[PDB]
């Protein structure tokens, strides 16, 4: 289980970055929607 | 009429740029999802053999 943990630790890193991207996407869409629908 | 069309195009320009940025982030997210898959694909090869 030693070689598998380095893999999982790198998976964890990528998952944080992915969550950061999803957070940016949602915020930009909220802004887009603000402009589109005039809110 | 033409002046109203200018403000419209400027916002439509802005909303398009917000969408072009979104598409870029979505591409980046897709690349991250590949790398994750390739890593889990190996965590299973090893865990399988081990």
Swiss-Prot record, chain B:
Residues 18-46 are annotated as: Leucine-zipper. Residues 1-50 form the bZIP domain. It is found in: Nucleus. Phosphorylated. It comes from the Eukaryota. Residues 1-17 are annotated as: Basic motif. Belongs to the bZIP family. Fos subfamily. Binds DNA via bZIP domain; DNA-binding is under control of cellular redox homeostasis (in vitro). To enable DNA binding, the bZIP domain must undergo a conformational rearrangement which requires the reduction of the interchain disulfide bond between FosB and JunD (in vitro). The bZIP domain is able to form homomeric oligomers via formation of interchain disulfide bonds under non-reducing conditions (in vitro). Under reducing conditions, the disulfide-bonded homomeric species dissociates into monomers (in vitro). Heterodimer; binds to DNA as heterodimer. Component of an AP-1 transcription factor complex; composed of FOS-JUN heterodimers. As part of the AP-1 transcription factor complex, forms heterodimers with JUN, JUNB or JUND, thereby binding to the AP-1 consensus sequence and stimulating transcription. Interacts with the BAF multiprotein chromatin-remodeling complex subunits SMARCB1 and SMARCD1. Interacts with ARID1A and JUN. Heterodimerizes with proteins of the JUN family to form an AP-1 transcription factor complex, thereby enhancing their DNA binding activity to gene promoters containing an AP-1 consensus sequence 5'-TGA[GC]TCA-3' and enhancing their transcriptional activity. As part of the AP-1 complex, facilitates enhancer selection together with cell-type-specific transcription factors by collaboratively binding to nucleosomal enhancers and recruiting the SWI/SNF (BAF) chromatin remodeling complex to establish accessible chromatin. This is Protein FosB. It comes from Homo sapiens (Human). The chain holds residues 166 to 215 of 338 of the full protein.
């Amino acid at each position: 289980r030693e070689l598998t943990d380095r893999l999982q630790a790198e998976t964890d890193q990528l998952e944080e970055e992915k969550a950061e991207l999803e957070s940016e996407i949602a915020e930009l869409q909220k802004e887009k929607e603000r402009l589109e629908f005039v809110l």
